[PDB]
Amino acid sequence: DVGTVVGIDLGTTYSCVGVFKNGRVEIIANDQGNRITPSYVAFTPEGERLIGDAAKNQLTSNPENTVFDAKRLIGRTWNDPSVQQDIKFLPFKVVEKKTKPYIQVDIGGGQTKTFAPEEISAMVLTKMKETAEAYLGKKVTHAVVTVPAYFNDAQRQATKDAGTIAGLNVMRIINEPTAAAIAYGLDKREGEKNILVFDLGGGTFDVSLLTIDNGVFEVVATNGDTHLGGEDFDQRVMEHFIKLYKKKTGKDVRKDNRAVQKLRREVEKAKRALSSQHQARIEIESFYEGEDFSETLTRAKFEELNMDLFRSTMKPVQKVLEDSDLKKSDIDEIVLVGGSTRIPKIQQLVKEFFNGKEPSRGINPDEAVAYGAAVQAGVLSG
Numbered sequence: 001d002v003g004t005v006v007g008i009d010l011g012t013t014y015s016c017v018g019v020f021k022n023g024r025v026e027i028i029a030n031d032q033g034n035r036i037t038p039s040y041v042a043f044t045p046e047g048e049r050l051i052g053d054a055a056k057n058q059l060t061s062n063p064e065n066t067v068f069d070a071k072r073l074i075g076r077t078w079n080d081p082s083v084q085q086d087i088k089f090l091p092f093k094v095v096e097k098k099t100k101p102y103i104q105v106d107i108g109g110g111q112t113k114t115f116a117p118e119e120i121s122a123m124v125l126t127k128m129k130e131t132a133e134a135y136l137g138k139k140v141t142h143a144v145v146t147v148p149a150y151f152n153d154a155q156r157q158a159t160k161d162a163g164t165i166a167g168l169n170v171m172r173i174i175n176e177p178t179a180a181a182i183a184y185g186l187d188k189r190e191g192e193k194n195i196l197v198f199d200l201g202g203g204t205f206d207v208s209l210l211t212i213d214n215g216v217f218e219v220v221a222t223n224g225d226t227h228l229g230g231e232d233f234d235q236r237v238m239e240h241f242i243k244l245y246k247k248k249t250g251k252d253v254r255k256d257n258r259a260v261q262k263l264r265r266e267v268e269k270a271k272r273a274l275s276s277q278h279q280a281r282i283e284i285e286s287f288y289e290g291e292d293f294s295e296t297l298t299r300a301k302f303e304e305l306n307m308d309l310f311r312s313t314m315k316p317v318q319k320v321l322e323d324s325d326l327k328k329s330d331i332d333e334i335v336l337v338g339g340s341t342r343i344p345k346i347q348q349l350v351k352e353f354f355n356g357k358e359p360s361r362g363i364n365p366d367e368a369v370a371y372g373a374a375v376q377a378g379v380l381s382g
Protein backbone atom coordinates (compact mmCIF):
# COMPACT_ATOMS: atom_id res chain seq x y z
CA ASP A 1 0.00 0.00 0.00
CA VAL A 2 1.65 3.22 -1.20
CA GLY A 3 -1.01 5.36 0.49
CA THR A 4 -1.59 8.92 -0.66
CA VAL A 5 1.18 9.93 -3.02
CA VAL A 6 2.23 13.59 -2.94
CA GLY A 7 3.68 15.79 -5.64
CA ILE A 8 6.76 17.84 -4.80
CA ASP A 9 8.42 20.64 -6.69
CA LEU A 10 11.92 20.53 -5.20
CA GLY A 11 13.09 23.94 -6.37
CA THR A 12 16.46 25.69 -6.40
CA THR A 13 15.26 28.54 -4.16
CA TYR A 14 11.66 27.50 -3.26
CA SER A 15 9.82 24.20 -2.96
CA CYS A 16 6.07 23.42 -3.13
CA VAL A 17 3.90 20.38 -2.37
CA GLY A 18 0.51 19.36 -3.67
CA VAL A 19 -1.84 16.43 -3.30
CA PHE A 20 -5.16 15.09 -4.62
CA LYS A 21 -7.35 15.18 -1.49
CA ASN A 22 -11.14 15.06 -1.97
CA GLY A 23 -11.28 14.69 -5.72
CA ARG A 24 -9.30 17.93 -6.12
CA VAL A 25 -5.62 18.97 -6.32
CA GLU A 26 -4.65 21.08 -3.28
CA ILE A 27 -1.45 23.12 -3.02
CA ILE A 28 -0.58 22.92 0.62
CA ALA A 29 0.28 25.83 2.91
CA ASN A 30 3.02 25.18 5.41
CA ASP A 31 2.88 25.94 9.09
CA GLN A 32 3.81 29.59 8.35
CA GLY A 33 0.82 29.86 5.98
CA ASN A 34 2.94 29.85 2.84
CA ARG A 35 2.33 27.65 -0.20
CA ILE A 36 6.04 27.82 -1.07
CA THR A 37 8.90 26.92 1.28
CA PRO A 38 12.49 28.16 0.89
CA SER A 39 14.93 25.38 0.06
CA TYR A 40 17.09 26.52 2.97
CA VAL A 41 18.71 24.83 5.98
CA ALA A 42 20.32 26.52 9.06
CA PHE A 43 20.92 25.86 12.78
CA THR A 44 20.08 27.61 16.06
CA PRO A 45 22.71 28.13 18.80
CA GLU A 46 21.26 25.10 20.65
CA GLY A 47 21.94 23.07 17.49
CA GLU A 48 18.29 22.86 16.44
CA ARG A 49 18.04 22.30 12.71
CA LEU A 50 15.97 24.99 10.96
CA ILE A 51 14.43 24.21 7.58
CA GLY A 52 12.51 26.52 5.27
CA ASP A 53 11.16 29.89 6.34
CA ALA A 54 12.81 29.65 9.77
CA ALA A 55 16.21 28.95 8.14
CA LYS A 56 16.01 31.73 5.56
CA ASN A 57 14.64 34.28 8.06
CA GLN A 58 17.17 33.67 10.88
CA LEU A 59 19.39 36.72 11.43
CA THR A 60 23.03 35.65 11.73
CA SER A 61 26.53 37.10 11.91
CA ASN A 62 27.74 33.78 10.40
CA PRO A 63 25.87 33.32 7.11
CA GLU A 64 28.45 30.73 6.05
CA ASN A 65 26.42 28.18 8.15
CA THR A 66 23.26 28.74 6.07
CA VAL A 67 22.84 26.30 3.24
CA PHE A 68 20.85 26.80 0.07
CA ASP A 69 21.11 26.11 -3.67
CA ALA A 70 21.99 22.40 -3.03
CA LYS A 71 20.13 21.67 -6.30
CA ARG A 72 23.05 23.30 -8.12
CA LEU A 73 25.38 20.54 -6.80
CA ILE A 74 23.15 17.50 -6.50
CA GLY A 75 24.20 14.55 -8.64
CA ARG A 76 27.42 16.20 -9.88
CA THR A 77 31.06 15.21 -9.58
CA TRP A 78 33.71 17.59 -8.23
CA ASN A 79 35.31 18.61 -11.51
CA ASP A 80 32.00 19.22 -13.31
CA PRO A 81 32.67 22.72 -14.69
CA SER A 82 29.29 23.80 -13.26
CA VAL A 83 30.44 22.82 -9.76
CA GLN A 84 33.81 24.52 -10.14
CA GLN A 85 32.14 27.80 -11.04
CA ASP A 86 29.34 27.65 -8.46
CA ILE A 87 31.74 27.03 -5.55
CA LYS A 88 33.34 30.43 -6.30
CA PHE A 89 30.03 32.19 -5.62
CA LEU A 90 28.30 30.16 -2.87
CA PRO A 91 28.78 31.79 0.56
CA PHE A 92 29.06 28.49 2.50
CA LYS A 93 31.99 26.05 2.24
CA VAL A 94 31.87 23.44 -0.49
CA VAL A 95 34.68 20.96 -0.15
CA GLU A 96 35.86 17.97 -2.16
CA LYS A 97 35.22 14.64 -0.51
CA LYS A 98 35.67 11.37 -2.37
CA THR A 99 35.97 13.43 -5.61
CA LYS A 100 32.45 14.92 -5.08
CA PRO A 101 31.13 18.24 -3.70
CA TYR A 102 30.09 18.25 -0.08
CA ILE A 103 28.78 21.09 2.05
CA GLN A 104 30.65 21.88 5.29
CA VAL A 105 29.00 23.86 8.12
CA ASP A 106 29.02 24.29 11.89
CA ILE A 107 25.75 23.05 13.43
CA GLY A 108 25.86 24.39 17.01
CA GLY A 109 28.01 23.54 20.02
CA GLY A 110 31.22 23.97 17.99
CA GLN A 111 30.35 20.83 15.99
CA THR A 112 31.23 20.70 12.30
CA LYS A 113 29.39 18.47 9.84
CA THR A 114 29.88 17.74 6.14
CA PHE A 115 26.75 16.97 4.08
CA ALA A 116 26.22 15.53 0.62
CA PRO A 117 23.92 17.73 -1.49
CA GLU A 118 21.31 14.95 -1.40
CA GLU A 119 21.38 15.12 2.44
CA ILE A 120 20.48 18.82 2.27
CA SER A 121 17.79 18.13 -0.28
CA ALA A 122 16.49 15.32 1.94
CA MET A 123 15.98 17.83 4.77
CA VAL A 124 13.95 20.05 2.41
CA LEU A 125 11.92 17.03 1.27
CA THR A 126 11.29 16.06 4.93
CA LYS A 127 9.80 19.54 5.53
CA MET A 128 7.60 19.20 2.45
CA LYS A 129 6.52 15.69 3.60
CA GLU A 130 5.60 17.09 7.03
CA THR A 131 3.60 19.95 5.46
CA ALA A 132 1.55 17.41 3.51
CA GLU A 133 1.13 15.00 6.44
CA ALA A 134 -0.26 17.81 8.63
CA TYR A 135 -2.83 18.75 5.97
CA LEU A 136 -3.80 15.14 5.16
CA GLY A 137 -3.85 13.91 8.75
CA LYS A 138 -1.86 10.85 7.73
CA LYS A 139 1.61 9.53 7.03
CA VAL A 140 3.14 10.01 3.61
CA THR A 141 5.60 7.41 2.26
CA HIS A 142 5.62 7.97 -1.56
CA ALA A 143 6.05 10.96 -3.90
CA VAL A 144 6.41 12.19 -7.43
CA VAL A 145 9.25 14.72 -7.58
CA THR A 146 9.97 17.16 -10.36
CA VAL A 147 13.40 18.10 -11.88
CA PRO A 148 14.58 20.44 -14.65
CA ALA A 149 14.23 18.92 -18.10
CA TYR A 150 18.04 19.18 -18.60
CA PHE A 151 18.79 16.99 -15.54
CA ASN A 152 20.81 13.93 -16.48
CA ASP A 153 20.52 10.35 -15.17
CA ALA A 154 22.84 11.01 -12.24
CA GLN A 155 20.95 14.11 -11.14
CA ARG A 156 17.62 12.27 -11.38
CA GLN A 157 18.94 9.32 -9.32
CA ALA A 158 20.47 11.70 -6.75
CA THR A 159 17.06 13.34 -6.35
CA LYS A 160 15.49 9.88 -5.74
CA ASP A 161 18.29 9.23 -3.22
CA ALA A 162 17.45 12.50 -1.39
CA GLY A 163 13.92 11.08 -1.16
CA THR A 164 15.15 7.80 0.30
CA ILE A 165 17.00 9.68 3.05
CA ALA A 166 13.79 11.62 3.78
CA GLY A 167 11.69 8.38 4.07
CA LEU A 168 10.10 8.88 0.66
CA ASN A 169 9.92 6.43 -2.18
CA VAL A 170 10.18 8.74 -5.16
CA MET A 171 8.10 6.65 -7.57
CA ARG A 172 8.52 8.99 -10.50
CA ILE A 173 10.89 11.81 -11.46
CA ILE A 174 9.15 14.08 -13.93
CA ASN A 175 10.20 17.16 -15.83
CA GLU A 176 9.26 20.59 -14.46
CA PRO A 177 7.90 22.11 -17.70
CA THR A 178 5.84 18.99 -18.39
CA ALA A 179 4.40 19.13 -14.86
CA ALA A 180 3.39 22.76 -15.48
CA ALA A 181 1.61 21.79 -18.72
CA ILE A 182 -0.17 18.92 -16.92
CA ALA A 183 -1.49 21.41 -14.32
CA TYR A 184 -3.34 23.15 -17.15
CA GLY A 185 -4.85 19.83 -18.37
CA LEU A 186 -2.86 19.92 -21.59
CA ASP A 187 -2.15 16.17 -21.28
CA LYS A 188 -5.91 15.40 -21.50
CA ARG A 189 -6.54 16.68 -25.01
CA GLU A 190 -6.85 14.85 -28.31
CA GLY A 191 -4.48 16.18 -31.02
CA GLU A 192 -1.05 17.86 -31.14
CA LYS A 193 0.09 21.24 -29.78
CA ASN A 194 3.35 23.19 -29.22
CA ILE A 195 3.75 24.58 -25.68
CA LEU A 196 6.36 27.21 -24.68
CA VAL A 197 7.12 27.06 -20.98
CA PHE A 198 8.71 30.26 -19.64
CA ASP A 199 10.05 29.53 -16.15
CA LEU A 200 11.65 32.36 -14.22
CA GLY A 201 12.33 31.12 -10.70
CA GLY A 202 14.23 32.50 -7.78
CA GLY A 203 17.67 31.59 -9.10
CA THR A 204 17.29 30.12 -12.60
CA PHE A 205 15.60 30.88 -15.88
CA ASP A 206 14.45 27.91 -17.99
CA VAL A 207 12.65 28.07 -21.34
CA SER A 208 11.36 24.80 -22.80
CA LEU A 209 9.50 23.94 -25.98
CA LEU A 210 7.25 20.93 -25.50
CA THR A 211 5.11 19.11 -28.02
CA ILE A 212 2.05 17.35 -26.73
CA ASP A 213 0.58 14.57 -28.87
CA ASN A 214 -2.41 12.72 -27.47
CA GLY A 215 -1.13 12.83 -23.86
CA VAL A 216 2.55 12.21 -24.70
CA PHE A 217 5.08 15.01 -24.11
CA GLU A 218 8.39 15.54 -25.88
CA VAL A 219 10.87 18.15 -24.66
CA VAL A 220 12.16 19.40 -27.99
CA ALA A 221 14.53 22.13 -26.90
CA THR A 222 15.61 23.98 -23.80
CA ASN A 223 17.48 27.20 -23.11
CA GLY A 224 17.66 29.91 -20.45
CA ASP A 225 20.17 31.28 -17.99
CA THR A 226 21.27 29.11 -15.10
CA HIS A 227 22.08 32.19 -12.95
CA LEU A 228 19.18 34.56 -13.61
CA GLY A 229 16.19 34.70 -11.26
CA GLY A 230 14.16 36.73 -8.84
CA GLU A 231 17.07 36.95 -6.39
CA ASP A 232 19.01 38.88 -8.97
CA PHE A 233 16.25 41.50 -9.19
CA ASP A 234 16.42 41.81 -5.42
CA GLN A 235 20.20 42.30 -5.58
CA ARG A 236 19.81 45.20 -8.05
CA VAL A 237 17.48 46.88 -5.59
CA MET A 238 19.90 46.05 -2.71
CA GLU A 239 22.78 47.71 -4.56
CA HIS A 240 20.62 50.77 -5.28
CA PHE A 241 19.72 51.26 -1.60
CA ILE A 242 23.19 50.47 -0.25
CA LYS A 243 24.54 53.17 -2.61
CA LEU A 244 21.76 55.62 -1.62
CA TYR A 245 22.37 55.03 2.09
CA LYS A 246 26.12 55.69 1.72
CA LYS A 247 25.35 58.89 -0.21
CA LYS A 248 22.86 60.15 2.39
CA THR A 249 24.72 59.04 5.58
CA GLY A 250 28.34 58.27 4.58
CA LYS A 251 27.99 54.73 5.99
CA ASP A 252 28.71 51.52 4.05
CA VAL A 253 26.38 48.92 5.54
CA ARG A 254 28.02 45.92 3.82
CA LYS A 255 30.21 45.72 6.99
CA ASP A 256 27.25 44.33 9.02
CA ASN A 257 25.87 40.93 7.87
CA ARG A 258 22.66 41.41 9.88
CA ALA A 259 21.98 44.85 8.34
CA VAL A 260 22.28 43.40 4.83
CA GLN A 261 19.97 40.51 5.82
CA LYS A 262 17.37 42.99 7.13
CA LEU A 263 17.49 45.02 3.96
CA ARG A 264 17.27 41.85 1.83
CA ARG A 265 14.13 40.72 3.73
CA GLU A 266 12.41 44.06 3.22
CA VAL A 267 13.47 44.25 -0.44
CA GLU A 268 11.95 40.82 -1.11
CA LYS A 269 8.69 41.97 0.52
CA ALA A 270 8.70 45.29 -1.38
CA LYS A 271 9.37 43.54 -4.70
CA ARG A 272 6.35 41.26 -4.19
CA ALA A 273 4.19 44.27 -3.20
CA LEU A 274 5.20 46.02 -6.45
CA SER A 275 3.54 43.25 -8.48
CA SER A 276 0.17 44.64 -7.32
CA GLN A 277 1.01 48.27 -6.29
CA HIS A 278 2.93 51.12 -7.94
CA GLN A 279 5.08 51.95 -4.86
CA ALA A 280 6.19 50.22 -1.64
CA ARG A 281 7.82 51.41 1.61
CA ILE A 282 10.93 49.75 3.00
CA GLU A 283 11.34 50.46 6.69
CA ILE A 284 13.98 49.02 9.04
CA GLU A 285 14.36 49.94 12.66
CA SER A 286 17.98 50.02 13.90
CA PHE A 287 19.28 49.24 10.43
CA TYR A 288 22.91 50.22 10.96
CA GLU A 289 24.81 51.62 13.93
CA GLY A 290 21.47 52.24 15.68
CA GLU A 291 19.96 54.39 12.89
CA ASP A 292 16.64 53.69 11.18
CA PHE A 293 16.12 53.18 7.45
CA SER A 294 12.97 54.32 5.61
CA GLU A 295 12.71 54.64 1.84
CA THR A 296 10.12 54.15 -0.86
CA LEU A 297 10.64 52.17 -4.07
CA THR A 298 8.37 52.83 -7.07
CA ARG A 299 7.52 50.18 -9.61
CA ALA A 300 9.09 52.44 -12.30
CA LYS A 301 12.41 52.47 -10.39
CA PHE A 302 12.24 48.70 -9.77
CA GLU A 303 11.74 48.20 -13.50
CA GLU A 304 14.53 50.67 -14.42
CA LEU A 305 17.04 48.98 -12.13
CA ASN A 306 16.30 45.62 -13.77
CA MET A 307 15.28 46.42 -17.32
CA ASP A 308 18.44 44.85 -18.85
CA LEU A 309 17.85 41.63 -16.93
CA PHE A 310 14.15 41.54 -17.87
CA ARG A 311 14.97 42.10 -21.56
CA SER A 312 17.65 39.39 -21.51
CA THR A 313 14.94 36.74 -21.03
CA MET A 314 13.82 37.11 -24.67
CA LYS A 315 16.93 35.80 -26.49
CA PRO A 316 16.63 32.29 -24.94
CA VAL A 317 13.01 32.18 -26.17
CA GLN A 318 14.09 33.03 -29.71
CA LYS A 319 16.84 30.35 -29.50
CA VAL A 320 14.37 27.68 -28.33
CA LEU A 321 12.07 28.48 -31.25
CA GLU A 322 15.00 28.22 -33.69
CA ASP A 323 16.15 24.88 -32.22
CA SER A 324 12.54 23.57 -32.41
CA ASP A 325 12.22 24.74 -36.03
CA LEU A 326 9.18 26.82 -35.03
CA LYS A 327 8.02 30.40 -35.51
CA LYS A 328 6.24 32.53 -32.87
CA SER A 329 2.90 31.77 -34.56
CA ASP A 330 3.38 27.99 -34.10
CA ILE A 331 3.15 28.35 -30.32
CA ASP A 332 -0.29 27.16 -29.15
CA GLU A 333 0.18 27.89 -25.45
CA ILE A 334 2.55 29.94 -23.34
CA VAL A 335 2.81 28.64 -19.75
CA LEU A 336 4.33 30.99 -17.13
CA VAL A 337 6.16 29.36 -14.22
CA GLY A 338 7.88 31.01 -11.24
CA GLY A 339 6.77 33.94 -9.04
CA SER A 340 8.95 36.33 -11.05
CA THR A 341 6.50 35.89 -13.95
CA ARG A 342 3.98 37.77 -11.68
CA ILE A 343 6.06 40.93 -12.33
CA PRO A 344 3.87 43.04 -14.63
CA LYS A 345 6.83 44.06 -16.78
CA ILE A 346 7.86 40.39 -17.42
CA GLN A 347 4.27 39.49 -18.44
CA GLN A 348 4.22 42.53 -20.75
CA LEU A 349 7.52 41.57 -22.39
CA VAL A 350 6.38 37.99 -22.98
CA LYS A 351 3.02 39.10 -24.43
CA GLU A 352 4.79 41.57 -26.71
CA PHE A 353 7.34 38.97 -27.88
CA PHE A 354 4.39 36.79 -28.98
CA ASN A 355 2.62 39.68 -30.71
CA GLY A 356 -0.25 40.07 -28.24
CA LYS A 357 -0.86 36.42 -27.24
CA GLU A 358 -1.78 36.32 -23.51
CA PRO A 359 0.57 34.03 -21.51
CA SER A 360 -1.18 31.65 -19.08
CA ARG A 361 -0.96 32.42 -15.38
CA GLY A 362 -4.46 31.23 -14.30
CA ILE A 363 -2.78 28.67 -12.05
CA ASN A 364 -0.38 30.44 -9.67
CA PRO A 365 2.98 30.26 -11.51
CA ASP A 366 4.80 29.35 -8.26
CA GLU A 367 2.48 26.39 -7.75
CA ALA A 368 1.97 25.01 -11.29
CA VAL A 369 4.86 22.53 -11.24
CA ALA A 370 3.71 21.01 -7.89
CA TYR A 371 0.14 21.01 -9.19
CA GLY A 372 1.11 18.84 -12.20
CA ALA A 373 3.22 16.59 -9.98
CA ALA A 374 0.16 16.11 -7.75
CA VAL A 375 -2.06 15.23 -10.77
CA GLN A 376 0.41 12.49 -11.72
CA ALA A 377 0.71 11.38 -8.08
CA GLY A 378 -3.11 11.01 -7.88
CA VAL A 379 -3.10 8.16 -10.37
CA LEU A 380 -0.46 6.27 -8.35
CA SER A 381 -2.24 6.52 -4.98
CA GLY A 382 -3.73 3.40 -3.39
Ligand SMILES: Nc1ncnc2c1ncn2[C@H]1C[C@H](O)[C@@H](COP(=O)(O)OP(=O)(O)OP(=O)(O)O)O1
Nearest residue numbers: 230271272273275276338339340341342343364366
Ligand atom coordinates in the same frame (compact mmCIF):
# COMPACT_ATOMS: atom_id res chain seq x y z
N1 LIG B 1 8.84 36.00 -6.85
C1 LIG B 1 7.97 37.06 -6.99
N2 LIG B 1 8.35 38.17 -7.62
C2 LIG B 1 7.47 39.18 -7.75
N3 LIG B 1 6.22 39.24 -7.34
C3 LIG B 1 5.86 38.12 -6.71
C4 LIG B 1 6.68 37.01 -6.51
N4 LIG B 1 5.98 36.03 -5.83
C5 LIG B 1 4.77 36.58 -5.62
N5 LIG B 1 4.67 37.83 -6.15
C6 LIG B 1 3.49 38.69 -6.07
C7 LIG B 1 2.18 38.24 -6.75
C8 LIG B 1 1.13 38.83 -5.79
O1 LIG B 1 0.90 40.17 -6.09
C9 LIG B 1 1.79 38.77 -4.42
C10 LIG B 1 1.36 37.57 -3.60
O2 LIG B 1 1.50 36.35 -4.38
P1 LIG B 1 1.26 34.91 -3.64
O3 LIG B 1 2.13 34.74 -2.42
O4 LIG B 1 1.52 33.85 -4.74
O5 LIG B 1 -0.23 34.92 -3.15
P2 LIG B 1 -1.63 35.01 -3.89
O6 LIG B 1 -1.53 35.93 -5.06
O7 LIG B 1 -2.22 33.68 -4.25
O8 LIG B 1 -2.50 35.68 -2.72
P3 LIG B 1 -3.19 35.09 -1.40
O9 LIG B 1 -2.27 34.22 -0.62
O10 LIG B 1 -3.57 36.28 -0.55
O11 LIG B 1 -4.41 34.31 -1.81
O12 LIG B 1 3.21 38.72 -4.66
Ligand SMILES: [Mg+2]
Nearest residue numbers: 011201338369
Ligand atom coordinates in the same frame (compact mmCIF):
# COMPACT_ATOMS: atom_id res chain seq x y z
MG1 LIG C 1 10.97 26.19 -10.42
